[model samples]
Target: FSVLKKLGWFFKAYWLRYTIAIVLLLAVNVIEMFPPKLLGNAIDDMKAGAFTAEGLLFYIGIFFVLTAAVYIMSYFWMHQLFGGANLMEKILRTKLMGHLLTMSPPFYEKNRTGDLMARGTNDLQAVSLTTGFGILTLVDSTMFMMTIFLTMGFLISWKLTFAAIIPLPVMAIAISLYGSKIHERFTEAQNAFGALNDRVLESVSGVRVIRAYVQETNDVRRFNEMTADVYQKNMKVAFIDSLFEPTVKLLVGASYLIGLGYGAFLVFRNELTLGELVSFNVYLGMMIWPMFAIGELINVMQRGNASLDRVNETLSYETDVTDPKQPADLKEPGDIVFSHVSFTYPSSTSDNLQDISFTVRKGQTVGIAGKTGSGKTTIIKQLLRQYPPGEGSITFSGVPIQQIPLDRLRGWIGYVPQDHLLFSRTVKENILYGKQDATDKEVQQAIAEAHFEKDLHMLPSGLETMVGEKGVALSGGQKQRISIARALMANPEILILDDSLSAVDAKTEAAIIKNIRENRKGKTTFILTHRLSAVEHADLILVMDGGVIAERGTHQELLANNGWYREQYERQQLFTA
Candidate 1:
């Protein structure tokens, strides 16, 4: 009942469907009452020697008609009620995913993919099931029980009806106590299930690595532990659920004893007819369904309430990255400036980048060289607004990055990261991710530009070859080239290559670099790399160390200065030679 209140917005939206279902359900329950009454009357008539062949045939025909009608009404009402539940699930999933899409990088850092996955699927299912079947049980059990009690009391004896109902309050109280246990246990059970979901997803995604390291046994053991934990948690829930039917049955059996004992006495006392006593007992039997449903209703409602609360908690989280209410725009972007930019991750004590400042003119090729964890990727993310800088400002054409509309700002840039992500799609389809409406010729051009032209021919089906789950069928170099071609499909104004060229050989690297220089003559490009040869001919080079620029100069000036850059460059060149 309370869960329905929380989902009032859905009821308000689909009120008419519910109204029709309510009418049909009540009508069906009422229609169901006559069959028992008709049988009782016919039994009395036969006992009195007043039964007729015509009357018996009429009773049989009417019974069949009523049965068919009840089934038909039951079908429609159930459809109408359960139909809303299905719609609610669909709408809730859309809302959950739609909200998730707007979240920034930090959100993923805090929330596990599997945990979120459970919220979208398993939790949503629990909520929807309760909305459909729970509501059905609520109405059918309570309402039909009352309707049967009325007919039994008025048509036969009221005292016997009261005697039969005496044990129900105890059952209700017991169900209430167990319902509380279920809610608490259900929340933990769902949490455990989410952990298991994540474990399988992570392990399967890393299956090759797990086998490569000979840790299949260890992984299996850990998976077994998680499964055992999940089973125990769910066992608690199932234990409570298992109590429902039997508990109801025990009390219902008590009611049956009282009904039969008292009903027989009334018949022997000449206060009730034998036929009426039979009908009274049959009515008592009819109460079984509602009594049994009490347990099921509470179980579903409690679990759904817990799951819905969990889902709502996820939906309530506010993401840090949001568009400004009043955005500023520009016709053409100018020099991108990082004015003493600094960023410290939320979990880290030290800054990832500190006091990093530079300016690149519209057409300049600026190279950022750094070791691992030297804030190269961190710098690129700052420009892309993945995370807000802790202190200082970044601007495009002097307009603050924060002020510019995110779509417009990102629209101008094409970024390729070190760990390239490819979908399980064909080579052409993967490239089309950059520009969905790209033509065959445009895709070929982009492929050729990224130096993937030779590899395309060697592939099993050229452009149409499946990459197979993060390009598992392809080599490291092939995946990187596909990623590059995808980025090139955008032909962006500001291109940031974050160590994306590490896998390609020196000759191929030179050819791709030459193509980029030719095609993007007037565009700004930022290359972050470990290889010094990749940035030797840059307009300016910033060699970074420990979140700060250790040296800033052209390749020629850095070599002449006899600094760390010159030393590292010579070391790399020596290896290459």
Candidate 2:
């Protein structure tokens, strides 16, 4: 009943279709009663020796008309009912997708991908069943049922009709008890499925790691254990599912016994005729569908109830990152400033970026160098607004970054990271992801700028080559250059390369860097790299240590100071030589 109430919103959404279906199905129920009554009348007439050819033909004609009407109405009502349920499924999936789009990194950290997938897929299907099949059984078990009882008692014998419904209340109570069990067991089974889903998703994604460590046997054993657990839980649900039919069959079968035996005694006493007894039995047979319908109603609704609870819990999560109601606009990302900025990750205790202060004016090239775990990436993420701003503020052209619209702020920056994620598509299509309407010449130019022009000649398909899942077919350097080409295609105002040149040779990195200085002269660029040569010609350089700028100077000035930058630079020169 609670599940039905939750689904009331869906019912109200398509009220007209349900109303038409309800009215027509009621009409179909009332019309069905006539066929048995017609059968009884003909039997009586034949026994009385008044069965003429005309009478026989007339009765057959009536039977044909009723059957045809029931068939046609059933078809149209099913269309309305099923159509409504399918439409609701589409809406539910769309809502989940939209919600997922707005969530931030913290939300993703809290929820597992496999569990979210199960909720979106299987759980939604269960809810859809509640709307489609559940409603059909609803009409079968309740309204259509009442009309059958009314017809049997009023038009036929009242005493026998009373006897047929004796075991029904007991059946309803037992099904209700079993429904709670199904609800409990199904929820556990769903959780178990999520665990298996997580196991499979994790194993497949980390297959390379497992094989390298020789843990294949261990993984397979764990998988088997998870599968066994899934089976045990599902079989528990199946046990309850099996009870529904037997409970329905046993009680309905008992109803048939009373109708035949007691009805025969009534006919022998002359209280009922032979034809009337046959008609009463025919009406009793109709009870079978409704009896099973009640049991199935409990079955579908309980599963839907548990599933809806899961879905609602998922949708209820609110992301901390959101757009401001009244936004402040910045036309250009002229001068970017970070003033006393501090941030801690949602899952971490200490600040990742602490007291980070810097300013990069328009058209200047800025270099950021740091240890692996230092605050290099954290400062870059501030520009992308992946998380909420911490203690201090980041301003674009003097307006705070938080006040600016996300799309507009993100539009100005072109970011290429170390782990270059690519889809399984042609190189041409992958680059087009940066700027959908880029011309062929623009694609060629971006590819040349990334210093990938020579590599294109080596491939069988050139730009048309299929980069398999995550660009597995390509070398590490090829993937990095392709990512650079993608970022270049955007023609952004500010470019950020976060250790992106690490995979490529220093010679190729130098060539790509030279291309950027020549072509994008007036655009602002931030390069964070371990290879000191990548940032030697930068207008400003910051040497980060322990999440703070330990040193700040240009190439010659840093060398003159003889600090960490000079020491690392000379060590790299010796190694390269």
Candidate 3:
């Protein structure tokens, strides 16, 4: 349904082009049929002892004209049809990307990243091939077959033509039976390919972990098994596809032999003319290849259908997050608040956060600290509206988050996720990602504020220094600081740094915090960290433990309380000493 819906929109927009291409294709097929009949007549003229040099020259001229016409039509449709297919592929890809962005975190949690990528690239490409090249093949093959049958019946006996096509129905049935198995195997092959991609992507992304644990060989072995599974499934489909061409060829060959032998006997017995016999042979030769094309047509169609199904499955996902049918545009940035909120991940039964309530009153530094799995990160995520709370409401100013246009909501905030994925680009380009129109002076200020200036200065190219994939050329601390610089460049209404300082040295981390304190005032900031020093100067600190708020107060008040926050702070102090 999804594939049909997408194609239907495409066809509606460009119906005239498709119509012209199809009509041209039909005329080309009709013109092609003339050559076979003309060949037989020319051959019979030669055999009758009545051939002339002038007549032969005339026929030669006609042949070239026919060939030229066929070439022109074929080229026209080839350009038009394939061009349309490429355009449709682009439209489909844009829709897929738009769909994926709107989908909630739960949807991604259920579907592997590799599988989605495969659907987007491989499966979508397969669909484009079928829609573009395969559709052209279908039109040409079907029209050729129709013209051949009609021309044969008009020029010769209808009975013989019917007799020759009897085996085609049987061949088609056999193809149908084998095609089911091929489709199943091909579907499995596609799935295996997706799994293989997933394994490779994971290995590359987590190379550090794999090398640290010395599990490279084991990972390789598992990947090999995945490849083997893919190979076996592909071989199954290949075996079935291989049988199709031979089976059709054999059937067509048998029919050709029967037609020629019977027609020759009829000519000798005075029941048919030598010209008719020659024409029958010419038509038989032309039709045989068209018969073979039927199998290829079915093969491509089935493969396309299978690929479309896989792509549609990805498109079929119902996203939990979507902008309202009519959304209210925010006039200006305002306070973001969570009122009696609760959330549990789709994969987990228990809430990652329960009964959490907080308010960042437009421009205040609200710090959050907690033990592992105490929902510190969850609170920051709510600010970005990554996963909206299930039971309670979250609002920006007085407007509910769901009511705000997605662009406005995301545009207003600067969020640095725990794992900042740096693109393979120059340091300046990476920082400029958040604000493309930023001035060089502004860029330098952000770099200085994030404490990346020292690292940038050490590199030969300074701002132009190339960061390898995911900033692999830089150390963890440098990557973290680059991300901080990127966030700062946005000049956001709210900045949520979820363990953003974890990767840096103590001195660097302190410098970054100090810079934030000086430059980032009058902007709402939410800092989440296990390290007490990172959040000690915040206007409000909320200490969490076991998915509940254990305490909330100023840093001094928390110290005076002698609770979880105090215990963790003292332990960290001892370690530092």
Candidate 4:
């Protein structure tokens, strides 16, 4: 019932349609009551030996008309009611997807992909049933029950009708108790199903790893355990669900026994006619559906309440990142300045980047080199605003980065990460993702600049070849170059290569660097890499250690100083030789 209150907005929107459908439903129930009365009258006439052929024909014709009316009205009401149900499902799914797109990385970190998927599909379906079938049972049971009860009491015999309903109170109490248990168990079942969904997704995505480790049997056993848990939880729900029909039927059978037995005593005493007894029995039969509907209504409502609460809880989470009311303008690329910046990831005690201060003017190529986990990628992440900076301000183009609109800030940068993620699509389509409307000539130029022109010819279908899931069909170096080509196609004002050239051969790396130097003369670029030669020719090189800049100078100056940079460079050169 409270869930219905929460969904008032949707109900208000479709109130007119729902009202019409309910009215039609009521009309169908009223029409359905007629046949029993007409049959009883014909029986009485036949018993009196006063029935004519025309009277019998007339009664049959009236019954047929009533049945036809019920059919036509039933059809329209079903369409109208279920149409609203389907529409709500679509709206809710779209809303969830839109909300997911706007959420920050922290949201994804906190939630599981498979659980979110379960909410969107299974939970939403349950909510839809509440609005559709739940509403139907609510209306049909109440209206039809009252109509048939009145027909039995007033039109036939009040005493027999009173006796018929003696066992109904017991049925109501039993079903209410079952409904509570069903609600509790259904929630557990749904949660188990979400866990199972996550396990399946994780298993599928890491299938290669499982086979490589030869743990297929163990993985299958674990999956079997999860499925068994799901089955057990649902069995609890089914046990409760299975009680509903038998309880209703048992009470209904008692009412029928009492009605017929008592009505026979009345007919013997001349308190009721034989024909009226027949009508009363027929009316009692009509009450069965309403009783069954009560069980169904309770079942659907409990499930809906549980699922709606889950969805509402998800939607209630406010995004950590939001746009400012008054944002500063940033029309062009300028010097990027970090002033005494320190950052610790959410829920971490130690800082990943501490006391980092630097500036790179427009058109300069800044290089960052560091050992693994030495905060090199953390620096790039700060510039990209993946997480908010701590302790100090970062400014781009003489304005704080946070003050810039997020879309405009990201639009100015072309970023190629260490782990390239390509869609399962044609090479041409993947490249076009950087700029949706990029021209063919622009695509070719980007390919050439990234030193991928030779690889294209070797591919079976050239640019049209499908790169399987996550570019599985391509080699590591090929995937990296395709990612580089994607960034190059954007021709952005600031290009960021975060260890992006590591997989390529030294010759290809030098050739691509040369192409970038010639083609992007006045644009800003930031390169984070471990390879010394990759940053040898940069205008400025930063050697990072233990979350701080240990050394900063030109490659020549660093070599002359004989610091960590010089030692790493000499070792790399010896290895290469």
Candidate 5:
């Protein structure tokens, strides 16, 4: 019922095609009734010595015409019914993708990448198959059954016709009895399949890690176990599928025997003609297919329902963060403030950032240094509006961060995360991702500012060199420089480098920072780094510890105070010395 309700949207679009197909199917069924009658007529004609050459020729022509018409109509509806399946599946995938894009990060966190892929691909394919091919079978069975029942009543005794169809009610009862369980089992099987796909994807993605730990054989064993579990569940469904045929066949055969016995007795008593008995036999044979199709329809409906549920689960994910229908753009870069702001991780009970308050004016370099897991990254993520803060507010240029359109807010800030993700594209293309429309000259300028020009020249193809997957072809330091240059190419009002220089040597890091200081003179910059040299030149340095601001001052001022920042900086310097 739920699946059928959800499919209403799809049905509305293709209703015209459906109507035409159903009409053609009806015509085909009507034409089919003519064959049994014609056969009966020919039988009676021969029995009465009416098999003259002219009469025989006339009957042959009628038979040929009827068969040709049935063929033509069947071909027409097959084209119509099957053609709609392709269009409907395409429409479903498009809608799913569009919906996926609107979902928030939390949605992705809950749903694995491979699971979503399976739902969109494998499950959707099942839905299309059931919808199109299954519908064709359903219509054929229904129309044929109706035609047979009606024709049998007129040709033979109504008593025999009723007896012949007695199993229909019983078959319906059996289908209704087991159909819900079949549907439930199929749903569980699909879910298991999705989980299996997710596990495989996770293993493939982490294959390098598995090999590093000498766990390749263990990983393969685990995958086999997962798949074996899936197979067991599928076998359960197969067991149910196997039962449909024989059980329905037994009921159908019993009904046939009853009708055959009665019709034979009537003929023996001379109460029925030979033509009628022969027609009755033919109708009984034709009824077998329609009865069998009841089982087939049940199976298809179960699969379609299961697939529909999976697809809808993905599509119906709620998005907490979204752009407003009418968004107000931020006109210029200005001050940012955390007005008693606090935040908690989605899965954690404790606050990651609590009562954090600060202000950084435009063009000022704000440095945040903290121990690991001191909510440093969380603060930066707040600026990016990745998720809404748990309490209080974060504002940019007097407008709340939540109110500012995400694209407009992000446009103003060129953010480079701790883990820089690089696509499998050329070096120049990777940098161009920072600003898609950046000119070649602008790209080079950014690379020079980040001190990446020397590394760029080392590559065989220079700027056009392929970076390979996740920039695997390049050294860690080289990838960091590429990411820095990419961010700088944006020419943003604010720039953030979250441990961006960690991969490089101290000397190279100093040179890059010097270049940024000289060139990025008036742009607001936020440097989140553990290295003291990275933040020593900042206008303001913030020391965060245990989700609170412990200290705030200039580098020399904080060193003079001998606070947390000073101790950490001196500790690192002692090691290097």
Candidate 6:
């Protein structure tokens, strides 16, 4: 009942369909009461020696017509009810996916992918069952139970009806107790299933690592243990599910015993007719389904209740980053300023960037170079607003970056990260992701700019070749060039190359950098790299150490100073030679 309140929005939307289905269901129950009465009348006629062949034929014909009517109307009601359930399932899944897209990096850091996937898939199915089958059982059991009891009390004998229903209260109590346990056990089963799903996804994605380390046997054992736990949890649920039917049958059996035994006493005393007794027994037989349906109703609703709570909890999480209500207009190729900013990651205890300050005027090429974990990439991350700065401000064109709309701000920049992630798609499709409507000539220009034109002929399918999952079919250098081509296809006002040339040789890197300088003459660019040679031609370079800038100047000025920058540059130059 509480679960129904949570899903009231969906029910309200399709109220008309549900109303019609319920009406048809009630009509079916009323029509079903006629057959037993008709049988009783025919039995009385035969006992009185008044039955004829023609009369018997007419009764059988009416019974067939009633059966056909029930079948047709049942089909229509089932379609209406189940159709509404399917629609809700689709709507909830799409809504969940859209909500997930709005969340930031911190949201994903706190939740597991496999658990989210399970909520969207398995939990959604359980909820749909409650809306469809659970609703059907509820309506059918209540309507039929009431209609049958009324017919017996008013049309037949109230005494027999009252005597027969004495055991129903005891059955209700037993079923209610079982319902609570089912709710608790079903919740545990669903969580175990989610954990098992995570195990499978982790195993598949890390299969290469497992085999490389020769730990296949240990991995198999771990998976088996997880599966056994899932089985044990479900078995506990099954134990409760198994009790429902037999408990219902035993109660129904007792009602039948009381009806027949006491019913014979009334007939012998001339208080009940033999034909009426037959009909009363038949009506008791019909009560069996309604009793069984009570068990099913509790089972389905409890499972749905548990699953709905899980999904609702996920949807209630608010995103950490969002667009401002009133955003300032920002033009492209504006001055980028980072003023005394300090930042720490959400999960970290120490600052990753401390008192960082820099400015790049329009069309200026700025470079950042440092050792690993020296806060070089952290500076770029702050500019991109992946995480909010702990203190101070970042501005574009004299307006705070936070005041700019996120979409418009992102649209002005093209970023290529160090990982160079490419989807399992054709090379042309991957490149076109940056600019979906670009012409063939524009794509070719980008490919040439990244110095990837020569590799096109080497591929078996040219730009149409499948890259496999995560571009596994391509070499490291090839993947990096393709990523560059994607960023170049955007022709953005600002370009960010975050160690994007590491996989290529020195000659290729030089050619790509030369192309960028020639073609993108008036666009601002930020290059973060470990190789000092990559930033040698920049207008300004910043060298970082321990989350702070240690040196700042032109490449020649740093060489003259003979600091850490100079020592690292000399070492790399000698090593390359």
lDDT of 5 by residue, 50-165 (tens): 58989989989999999889899889888888888888789889988888877776678888999999988987887887778778768766777877888899877788888777
For all candidates in order, the CA lDDT equals 0.83, 0.84, 0.78, 0.83, 0.80, 0.83
Q: Which number leads on lDDT?
A: 2
Name the weakest run of 10 consecutive residues (lDDT summed) in model 1.
317-326
Candidate 6 per-residue lDDT over residues 201-235, each given as its tens digit: 99889999989999989989998998999999999
Query: Compared with the true structure, what per-residue lDDT tens digits does model 2 show for residues 301-413?
Result: 99999998888878865555656545675677888888888887668887877887788888889898867787788888877888777789888877888888788877888
As for model 2, its CA RMSD to the true structure in angstroms is: 4.3
What are the per-residue Cα lDDT tens digits for candidate 3 across 289-366?
554466666666767777888877888745565344466667756777778778775567987778767777766788
- lDDT per residue (tens digit) for residues 342-389 in model 4: 888776788878877788888888898877888888877877877755
- Model 5 scores what on Cα lDDT? 0.80
RMSD of 5: 5.2
TM-score of 6: 0.85
* Model 2 global lDDT (CA atoms, 0 to 1): 0.84
All-Cα superposition RMSD per candidate: 4.8, 4.3, 5.0, 4.5, 5.2, 4.4
lDDT of predicted model 3: 0.78
Instruction: Write candidate 1's Cα lDDT for 1-577 as tens digits.
Output: 7777888888899999999998999999898888878888888999997878899999999999999999999999989999989999998999898889888877888888988999998989999998888988988678998899898889888898899878877887777777778889999999999999999999999999999999999889999999999999999899887887788789878988988888778777877777777787788777766755787787788889888888887887555564654577586578888888878876689877788778989888889886677777787888787876568888887788788878877777888878967777777787787788886899888888988888777766754767855443578778778878877888788888888688888778878888887888698988888877778788889988778887778888878776675546567675866
Off by over 4 Å in 1: 167-254, 468-472, 566-576
Our tally of clashes for model 3 stands at: 0
Better model by lDDT: candidate 1 vs candidate 3 = 1
Return the clash pairs for model 2, or none.
none
| Native-referenced Cα lDDT, model 1 | 0.83
* Per-model TM-score versus the true fold: 0.87, 0.87, 0.84, 0.87, 0.81, 0.85
Q: Which pairs clash (backbone N, Cα, C closer than 3 Å) in model 4?
A: none
